[PDB]
XYZ file of C-alpha atoms in Angstrom:
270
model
C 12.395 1.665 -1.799
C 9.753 -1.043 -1.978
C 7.702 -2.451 -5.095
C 4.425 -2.514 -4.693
C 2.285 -3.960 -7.306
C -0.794 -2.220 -8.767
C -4.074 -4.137 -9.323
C -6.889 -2.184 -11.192
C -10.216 -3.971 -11.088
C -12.561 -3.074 -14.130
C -16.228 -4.461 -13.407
C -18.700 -2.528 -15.100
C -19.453 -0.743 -18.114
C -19.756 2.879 -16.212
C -16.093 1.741 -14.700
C -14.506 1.099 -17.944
C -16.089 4.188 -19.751
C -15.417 6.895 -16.607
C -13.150 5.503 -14.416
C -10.613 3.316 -16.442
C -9.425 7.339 -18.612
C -9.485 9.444 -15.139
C -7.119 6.174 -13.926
C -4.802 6.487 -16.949
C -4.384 10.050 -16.978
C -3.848 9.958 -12.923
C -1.219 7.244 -13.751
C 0.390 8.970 -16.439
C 0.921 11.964 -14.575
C 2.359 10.408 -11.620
C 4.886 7.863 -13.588
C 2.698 4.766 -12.367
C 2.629 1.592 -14.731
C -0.235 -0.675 -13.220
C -2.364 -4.080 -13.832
C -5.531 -3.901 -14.776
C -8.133 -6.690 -15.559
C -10.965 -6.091 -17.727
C -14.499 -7.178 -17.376
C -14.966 -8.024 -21.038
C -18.641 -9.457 -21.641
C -22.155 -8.198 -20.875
C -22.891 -6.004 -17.754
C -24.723 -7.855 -15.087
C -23.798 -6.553 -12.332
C -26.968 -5.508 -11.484
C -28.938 -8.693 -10.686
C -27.543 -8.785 -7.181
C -30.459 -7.285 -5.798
C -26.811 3.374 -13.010
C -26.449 -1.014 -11.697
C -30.065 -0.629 -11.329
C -30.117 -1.039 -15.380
C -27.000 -2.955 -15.400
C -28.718 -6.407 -16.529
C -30.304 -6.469 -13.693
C -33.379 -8.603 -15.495
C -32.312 -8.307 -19.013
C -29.251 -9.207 -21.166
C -26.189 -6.625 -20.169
C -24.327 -4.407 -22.491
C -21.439 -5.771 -23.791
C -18.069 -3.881 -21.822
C -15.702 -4.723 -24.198
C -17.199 -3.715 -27.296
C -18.742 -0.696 -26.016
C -15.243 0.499 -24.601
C -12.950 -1.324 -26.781
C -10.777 2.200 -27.556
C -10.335 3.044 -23.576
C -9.172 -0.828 -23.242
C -6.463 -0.821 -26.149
C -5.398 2.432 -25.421
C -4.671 0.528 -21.620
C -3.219 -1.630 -23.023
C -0.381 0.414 -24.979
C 0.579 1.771 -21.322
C 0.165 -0.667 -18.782
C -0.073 -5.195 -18.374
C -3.313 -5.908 -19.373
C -5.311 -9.016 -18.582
C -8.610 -10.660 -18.246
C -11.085 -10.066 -15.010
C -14.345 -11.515 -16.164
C -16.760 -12.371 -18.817
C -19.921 -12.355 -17.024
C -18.130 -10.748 -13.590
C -21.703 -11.709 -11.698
C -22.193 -15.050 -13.458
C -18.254 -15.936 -11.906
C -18.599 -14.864 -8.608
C -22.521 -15.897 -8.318
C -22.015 -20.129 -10.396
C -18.380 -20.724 -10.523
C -18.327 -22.753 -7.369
C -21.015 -25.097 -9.260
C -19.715 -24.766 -12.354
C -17.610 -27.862 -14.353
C -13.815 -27.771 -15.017
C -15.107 -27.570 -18.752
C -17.748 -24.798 -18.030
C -14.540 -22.631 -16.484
C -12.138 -23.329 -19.318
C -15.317 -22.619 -21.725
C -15.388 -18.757 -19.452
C -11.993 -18.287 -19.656
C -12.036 -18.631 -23.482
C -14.730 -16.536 -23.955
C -13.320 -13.900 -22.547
C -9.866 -14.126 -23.465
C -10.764 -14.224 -27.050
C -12.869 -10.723 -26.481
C -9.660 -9.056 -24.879
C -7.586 -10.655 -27.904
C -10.294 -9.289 -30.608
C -10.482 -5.476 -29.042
C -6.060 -5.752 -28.150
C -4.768 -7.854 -30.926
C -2.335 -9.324 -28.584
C -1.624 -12.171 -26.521
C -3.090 -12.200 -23.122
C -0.136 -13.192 -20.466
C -2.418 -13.155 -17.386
C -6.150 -13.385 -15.962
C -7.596 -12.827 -11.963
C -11.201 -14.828 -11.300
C -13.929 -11.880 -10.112
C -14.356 -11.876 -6.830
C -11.495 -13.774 -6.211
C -13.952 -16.827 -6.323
C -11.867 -19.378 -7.361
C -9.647 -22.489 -6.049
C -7.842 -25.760 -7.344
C -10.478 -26.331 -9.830
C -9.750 -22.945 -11.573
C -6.012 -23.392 -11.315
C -6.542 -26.803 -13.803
C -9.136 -24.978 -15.849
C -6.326 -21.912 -16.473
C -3.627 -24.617 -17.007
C -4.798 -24.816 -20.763
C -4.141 -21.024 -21.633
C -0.496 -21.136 -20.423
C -0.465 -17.497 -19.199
C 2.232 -15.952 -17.365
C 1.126 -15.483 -14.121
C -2.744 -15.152 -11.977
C -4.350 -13.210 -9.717
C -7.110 -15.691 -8.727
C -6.911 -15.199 -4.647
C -5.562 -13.735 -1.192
C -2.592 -14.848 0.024
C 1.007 -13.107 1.118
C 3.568 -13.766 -1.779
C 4.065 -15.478 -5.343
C 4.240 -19.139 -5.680
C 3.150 -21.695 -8.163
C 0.302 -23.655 -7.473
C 0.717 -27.694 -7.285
C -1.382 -29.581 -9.529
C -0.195 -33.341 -8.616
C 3.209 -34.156 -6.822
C 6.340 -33.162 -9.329
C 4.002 -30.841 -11.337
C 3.150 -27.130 -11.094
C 0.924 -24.944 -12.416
C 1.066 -21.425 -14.122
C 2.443 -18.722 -10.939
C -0.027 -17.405 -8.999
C 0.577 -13.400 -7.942
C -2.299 -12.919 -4.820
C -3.288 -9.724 -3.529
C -1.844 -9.761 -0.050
C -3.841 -6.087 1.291
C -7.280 -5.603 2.093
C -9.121 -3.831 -0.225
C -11.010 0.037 0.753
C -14.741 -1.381 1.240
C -13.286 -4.208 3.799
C -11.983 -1.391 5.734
C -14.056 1.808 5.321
C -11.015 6.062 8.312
C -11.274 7.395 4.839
C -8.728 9.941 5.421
C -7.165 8.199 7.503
C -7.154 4.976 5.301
C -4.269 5.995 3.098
C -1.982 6.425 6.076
C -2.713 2.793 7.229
C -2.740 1.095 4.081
C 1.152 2.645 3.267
C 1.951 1.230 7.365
C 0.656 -2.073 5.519
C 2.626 -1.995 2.432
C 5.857 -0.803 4.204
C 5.336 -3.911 6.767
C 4.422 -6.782 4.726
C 6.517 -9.949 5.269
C 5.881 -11.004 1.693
C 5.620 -9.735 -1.892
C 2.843 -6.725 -1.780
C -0.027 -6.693 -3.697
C -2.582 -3.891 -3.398
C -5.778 -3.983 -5.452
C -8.307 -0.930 -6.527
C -11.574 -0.885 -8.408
C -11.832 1.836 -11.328
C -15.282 2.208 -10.205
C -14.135 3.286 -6.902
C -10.387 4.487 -7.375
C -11.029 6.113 -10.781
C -14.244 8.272 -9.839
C -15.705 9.059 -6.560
C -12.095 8.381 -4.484
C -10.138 9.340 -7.106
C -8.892 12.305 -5.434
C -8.388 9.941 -2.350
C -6.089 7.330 -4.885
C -4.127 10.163 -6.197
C -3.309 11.352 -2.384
C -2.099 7.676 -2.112
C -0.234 8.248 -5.038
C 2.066 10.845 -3.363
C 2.330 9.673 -0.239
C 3.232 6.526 -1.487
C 5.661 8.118 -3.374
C 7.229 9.855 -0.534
C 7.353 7.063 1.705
C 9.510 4.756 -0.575
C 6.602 2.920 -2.487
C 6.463 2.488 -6.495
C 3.955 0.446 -7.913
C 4.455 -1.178 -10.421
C 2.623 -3.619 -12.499
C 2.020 -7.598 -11.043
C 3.738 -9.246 -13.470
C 6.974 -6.941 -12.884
C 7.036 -9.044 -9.455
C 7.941 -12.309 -11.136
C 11.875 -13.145 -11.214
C 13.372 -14.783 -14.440
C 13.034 -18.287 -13.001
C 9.851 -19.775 -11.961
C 11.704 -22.255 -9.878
C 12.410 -19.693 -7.214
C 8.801 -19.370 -6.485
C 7.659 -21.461 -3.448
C 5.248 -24.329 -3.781
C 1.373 -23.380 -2.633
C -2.294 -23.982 -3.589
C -5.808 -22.278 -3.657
C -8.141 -23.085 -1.414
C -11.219 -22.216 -0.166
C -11.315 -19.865 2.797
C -12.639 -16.410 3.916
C -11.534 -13.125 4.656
C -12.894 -10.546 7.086
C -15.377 -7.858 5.106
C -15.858 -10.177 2.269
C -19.153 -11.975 2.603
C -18.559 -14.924 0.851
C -15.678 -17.910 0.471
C -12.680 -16.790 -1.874
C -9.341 -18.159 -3.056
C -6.774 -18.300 -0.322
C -3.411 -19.272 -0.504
C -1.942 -22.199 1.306
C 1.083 -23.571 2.068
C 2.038 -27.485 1.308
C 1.154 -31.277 3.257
């Protein structure tokens, strides 16, 4: 039997109000505790061009505190954890953006997930997975368990300066649906994937994708996951008791095929 940790990516407003419920009651049924990472501020995911009133030249909806029942009731059942405030203003400015303006972010929208939880948040994951060694120092102040900030092939904590490390980093080691899409095909490959990884992994939906169009296609991964010696489980569940076992890495800047764009990648040492 393998572990295979869960990653839910909430986005949008439509994602958290449809798909995030059909995602908890197909995970409830099937005896599936996931990760998922909430989009917490305004909607803007339509200004890269229902998206084409999501912001898209106007201030967005607020996600949070129009779903802020579906979130809680997440997290009573599974890790919870912070995706985005403005998911478009990460992945569009972060690159440009000060080690103050990206501590500034991440406070905004952990304090949003703490107002609609009342509970600590233990981990975060940049949108887009645009982030690198900046971000690691910028989430150094909130002290969370782990992060999902990038693509890589197993846990490790990041290295700040020789003799110090940062807060463990838990990357999403699979390629995503849209960087592959066989459809029906694509659930027989990605289980070959998770069955052959050399590492610790990490597979990563979207509840606007997962939890309505292919959610008939995610609950047929479900089973055959099931039946070929997979459990996901939630991220965090991947960490061991010590830190110290983790190997030594860092973020950096690289790029992945069927993402256009530079994201995190992990790296090994000098």
């Amino acid at each position: 039997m393998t572990k295979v940790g869960l990653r839910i990516d909430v986005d949008t407003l439509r994602g958290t109000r449809e798909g995030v419920p059909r995602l908890l009651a197909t995970l409830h049924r099937h005896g599936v505790q996931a990760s998922f990472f909430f989009s917490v501020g305004p909607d803007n995911m339509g200004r890269h061009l229902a998206a084409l009133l999501a912001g898209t030249a106007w201030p967005g909806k607020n996600i949070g505190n129009a779903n802020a029942g579906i979130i809680r009731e997440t997290a009573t059942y599974h890790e919870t954890g912070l995706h985005a405030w403005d998911h478009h203003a990460w992945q569009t400015h972060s690159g440009h953006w000060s080690i103050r303006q990206l501590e500034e972010d991440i406070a905004r929208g952990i304090t949003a997930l703490e107002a609609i939880i009342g509970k600590p948040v233990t981990c975060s994951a940049a949108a887009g997975w645009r982030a690198d060694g900046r971000v690691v120092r910028a989430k150094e102040s909130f002290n969370l368990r782990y992060n999902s900030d990038c693509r890589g092939t197993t846990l490790f904590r990041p290295l700040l300066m020789p003799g110090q490390t940062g807060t463990p980093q838990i990357p999403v080691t699979l390629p995503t649906w849209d960087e592959v899409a066989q459809a029906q095909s694509f659930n027989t490959w990605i289980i070959s994937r998770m069955l052959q990884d050399k590492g610790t992994p990490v597979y990563t939906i979207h509840a606007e994708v997962e939890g309505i169009v292919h959610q008939p296609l995610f609950e047929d991964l479900l089973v055959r996951a099931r039946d070929a010696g997979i459990t996901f489980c939630p991220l965090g569940e991947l960490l061991p008791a010590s830190p110290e076992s983790l190997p030594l890495g860092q973020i950096v800047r690289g790029h992945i095929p069927g993402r256009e764009g530079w994201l995190g990648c992990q790296q090994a040492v000098s």
